[PDB]
Design a binder for this molecule. Structure first.
Ligand SMILES: [Zn+2]
Length: 46
């Protein structure tokens, strides 16, 4: 038969804030840096 039908790997670290995945612990951390850092998404205040 056919199972998985995929050839990439495993991505346990799946960010929720936006919905990103990774294959390492750090990869996720560094990624989260963006969300935390209020630069792109933010209220209307200058
Ligand atoms: Zn994310």
């Amino acid at each position: 038969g056919s199972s998985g039908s995929s050839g990439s790997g495993e991505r346990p670290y799946g960010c929720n804030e936006c919905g990103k995945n990774f294959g390492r612990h750090s990869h996720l951390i560094e990624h989260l840096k963006r969300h935390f850092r209020e630069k792109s998404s933010g209220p209307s205040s200058g």
